[PDB]
Design a protein around this ligand. Sequence first.
Ligand SMILES: CCCCCCCCCCCCCCCC(=O)O[C@H](COC(=O)CCCCCCC[C@@H](C)CCCCCCCCC)COP(=O)(O)O[C@H]1[C@H](O)[C@H](O)[C@@H](O)[C@@H](O)[C@@H]1O
Ligand code: HEM
Ligand code: HEM
Ligand SMILES: CCCCCCCCCCCCCC(=O)O[C@H](COC(=O)CCCCCCCCCCC)COP(=O)(O)O
Ligand SMILES: CCCCCCCCCCCCCC(=O)O[C@H](COC(=O)CCCCCCCCCCC)COP(=O)(O)O
Ligand SMILES: CCCCCCCCCCCCC
Ligand code: FES
Lengths: 126, 102, 22, 534, 143
Amino acid sequence: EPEIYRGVSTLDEPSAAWGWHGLKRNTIQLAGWISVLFMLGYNFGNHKGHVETIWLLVITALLVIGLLIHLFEPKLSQVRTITSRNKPVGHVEPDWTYDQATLTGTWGNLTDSQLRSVNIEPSRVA
Amino acid sequence: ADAEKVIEREGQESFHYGDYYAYSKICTHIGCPTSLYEAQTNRILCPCHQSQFDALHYGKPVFGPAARALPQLPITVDEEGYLIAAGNFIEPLGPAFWERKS
Amino acid sequence: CXXXXXXXXXXXXXXXXXXXXX
Amino acid sequence: SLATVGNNLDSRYTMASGIRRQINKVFPTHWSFMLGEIALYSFIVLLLTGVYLTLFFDPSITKVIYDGGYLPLNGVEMSRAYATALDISFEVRGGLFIRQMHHWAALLFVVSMLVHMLRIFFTGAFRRPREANWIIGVVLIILGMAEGFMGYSLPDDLLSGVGLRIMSAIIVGLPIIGTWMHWLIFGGDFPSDLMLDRFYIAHVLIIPAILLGLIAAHLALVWYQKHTQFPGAGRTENNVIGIRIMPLFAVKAVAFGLIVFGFLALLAGVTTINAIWNLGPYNPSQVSAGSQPDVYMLWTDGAARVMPAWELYLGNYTIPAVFWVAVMLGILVVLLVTYPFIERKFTGDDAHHNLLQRPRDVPVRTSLGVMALVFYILLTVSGGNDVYAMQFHVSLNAMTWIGRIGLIVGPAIAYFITYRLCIGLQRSDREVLEHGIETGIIKQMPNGAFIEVHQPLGPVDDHGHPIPLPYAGAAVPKQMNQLGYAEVETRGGFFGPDPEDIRAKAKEIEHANHIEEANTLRALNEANIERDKN
Amino acid sequence: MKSSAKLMYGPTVFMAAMAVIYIFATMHVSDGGSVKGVEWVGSVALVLSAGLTLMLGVYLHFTEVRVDVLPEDWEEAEVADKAGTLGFFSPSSIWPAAMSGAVGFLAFGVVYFHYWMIAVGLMLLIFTITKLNLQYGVPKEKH
Ligand SMILES: CCCCCCCCCCCCCCCC(=O)O[C@H](COC(=O)CCCCCCC[C@@H](C)CCCCCCCCC)COP(=O)(O)O[C@H]1[C@H](O)[C@H](O)[C@@H](O)[C@@H](O)[C@@H]1O
Ligand code: HEM
Ligand code: HEM
Ligand SMILES: CCCCCCCCCCCCCC(=O)O[C@H](COC(=O)CCCCCCCCCCC)COP(=O)(O)O
Ligand SMILES: CCCCCCCCCCCCCC(=O)O[C@H](COC(=O)CCCCCCCCCCC)COP(=O)(O)O
Ligand SMILES: CCCCCCCCCCCCC
Ligand code: FES
């Protein structure tokens, strides 16, 4: 059975019992927001150019987008549909090759004609 | 063509000769010499930490860690026709320190 | 914080030196 | 003749039991347990090449007209320091060799400690009870950097002089008492008399003494805790498994010792460093494009480059922009020094650890380490970003912005990747214990199923499917050659086939040897178990 | 590969015939939309293009003579005929990535035309190729 050591499951991090594992989610956002503050604060130098500010705003936007989907943790759900010749959840797949090797199941009822078409005479099966 | 689009500082409109401008060579960030004068972009680059001082804007920095513009020295020509200093700088030179301000 | 005491030009200037002594 | 020298040396120092104890100390054998020796040997080379270097050097700023070995620079007015440093490379037989040996040794010293510190950090050797060692070592590296800095500033050439100008102007622009402190160190305005004298007397005495004292204390304190080692077969937290001091450890230490000495002697000849004749005497007006201090000092200069113009004007007073640089560097040092304390606050584990831990098993610390390494490397690159910009055809403004932005997003990406890779390495380590070594024998079963042969490291239940062995903190084999299934079974020379008679016995002997070794190792393991249940 | 060794003769003879047509038609025909004279790029690289196919074809032909009737080459073969060992496939390795990194270093070496970078990249490549081959040979660690 999996064991939890310090809020970190051995299932997700195998050697959770051996070392420092997992930063609390609140510390990952403190760093993120402090970084965003620094990145916004870079716009207060003496540089006359505006190419560098385009990069600053783009990177800040990417950071903000990241820090929001880390915060609200957006999730979705299983689609739960059926496509052409696809079976719903809870269907058992016959071993086709096993049914082909030994005449069972799917290949359990062939006409004598169908036996000879796959190169085996019906007199060989009883 | 470049001397005509210079922006002077208040109090030092008379610090230039005809076409000659004299700025202190010591960087206003740290005391490195800023001697990388670019002939066309009219920017003076410091080799040490990459500050660019404008030459058409009384030495105002436009990049790097330098925050204060480069001090300008008044110059003129004497009777004999040699370039002389017409006066002294109106601010302390080189890097900033605690007591340096008015 | 922005700037200590450095300010822009008062008014645009032009002159002719014409430093002569014959 | 030898029986009698020992007899009358023991009869008066009662040293039979004291010496026997020292020569029987056991030391773990691991390649990463030697990186500390490199620093020691480089330090010995420094203090030895340094003493030779002081017999020809005059640390005076007094200006002279040069007439010497260097036929250029004849007639040029220079300091007494520069003229003598120029004389120990062009007028002293083998003086350039020793000068270059000195500088190369300095470089190796700093890199001998940095890499050592990385080993200590990653493996967790700073934990209880080894925090005095961490603090001592951190002080050692900072002082080593300071020592190196004041060393190459002694020749008083143009390149080093700009470093001193930068350093002086950093001090002078400190809030409140940066003006008085600057005047107290240099003894006046820069440059000053008694400025190359205070530096020379603190580089060949003050720092060396401090360093030697710290090193001696460091080594003695290490010898008291008798090292640490990785988890392995038969090794517990209350024992040391390795080799004795003699005859194995002492000889290996000497062998590696002279190897480092010999390597430094090669670079000293074949590779040029600090070609001071091309640099000229220090002049406050002249400067060069590549004015980077030195590799270990690049991070400080890189910090000064990427700091924006953030001056604080307070009426009659001003805070320079470089003040924040000082603050930042101060924080980096404080974070580095007091790491064991911050690591054990957020882990809540201080339990007298004597067994090391592989970096892969501590992802947070490993990731923080790689995060900090990227920070340091970016500062170092930014410190020489003008030579990067030209040689690699990149905009210098772009380099500055890369440094500025990269110090935020570089560390973040480093952490993410390193963490994931650590967990990945952990996962690969469990697959082997659960299923066995993945042999490369893709058999086809009669039904047609392609199956890979797996070699179990443990007992199996009914039909393969090995009983999963629990993780043990040690390195698990990953290939079949790691179990000696690829071992060459043909004794002899490159041409010599070797007689079968003597070839049969030797394979039998080695077979019996490793059988006995494995038997003794597993017996040690069993001893630990029945000892730990009481 | 019984039929594989044979189908290469098709392209071989085709390209051999086109190469000889090309040489004779280019050096003896004046069109007015070009000049007269043998073309030395479409000739050499099309003669030698047939060379590749011929080489592979001949090698596979010699190889297929001294091979028995394999189940994969047999029309009515049972799945149980190949039941056995399919030899040794490498399960994993880090060295492909490393040696791609090494060729990248040499690549940038040549781009910037830095001698040290070229030299380092060349010996950084030898090392990784060597380690790739000696991967399953690294002896058990002798103490
Ligand atoms: C080991 C892996 C290392 C990989 C690092 C690779 C990332 C480097 C990206 C480099 C982008 C450079 C684009 C160049 C852009 C440029 O040149 O612009 C300059 C200003 O640079 C900038 O702001 C760009 C800085 C922002 C870059 C952010 C870099 C962060 C990195 C570290 C993280 C992302 C990648 C992570 C990869 C890691 C792999 C793991 C996932 C200003 O132009 P300027 O010098 O003034 O010149 C012009 C006049 O000439 C002319 O008149 C004109 O009129 C003027 O307008 C002016 O432009
Ligand atoms: C002056 C440079 C240094 C020298 C000559 C030096 C020397 C040594 C030596 C010879 C050892 C014995 C074990 C080994 O080789 O690994 C050692 C261990 C150690 N050093 Fe250093 N060291 C230096 C720098 C540092 C630094 C910078 C740190 C820490 C920031 C440090 C912390 C340690 C620790 C914790 C150990 C114990 C390793 C263990 O016992 O497992 N040392 N040092
Ligand atoms: C503690 C470790 C030491 C380091 C890291 C170190 C580093 C350096 C460096 C980098 C230089 C510049 C050399 C050059 O110009 O090529 C230097 C010069 C010098 N060092 Fe050291 N040094 C150390 C110890 C010593 C010691 C112990 C002494 C004297 C007992 C010494 C005496 C000298 C002298 C005289 C110079 C002369 C400057 C010259 O000739 O270039 N050093 N040192
Ligand atoms: C040779 C290098 C070896 C030394 C490695 C350096 C390690 C010292 C750093 C200690 C880090 C402490 C981490 C920690 O405990 O995590 C947390 C500490 O809190 C923080 O995250 C601090 C946030 C500060 C962010 C800084 C932003 C940087 C902006 C860019 C500036 C330009 C606590 O961890 P936990 O709560 O248990 O998850
Ligand atoms: C660890 C951090 C190091 C800090 C460096 C900061 C980053 C800036 C680097 C600038 C690189 C400049 C490269 C360059 O311009 O190339 C050359 C200038 O510098 C060099 O020669 C680089 C030498 C580096 C050592 C390589 C030795 C190779 C022998 C290996 C034998 C084992 C110019 O090209 P060239 O020499 O003519 O081939
Ligand atoms: C047979 C009696 C004389 C030999 C006895 C051994 C002498 C003492 C050796 C002490 C070793 C200390 C280095
Ligand atoms: S010293 Fe001129 S920019 Fe830093």
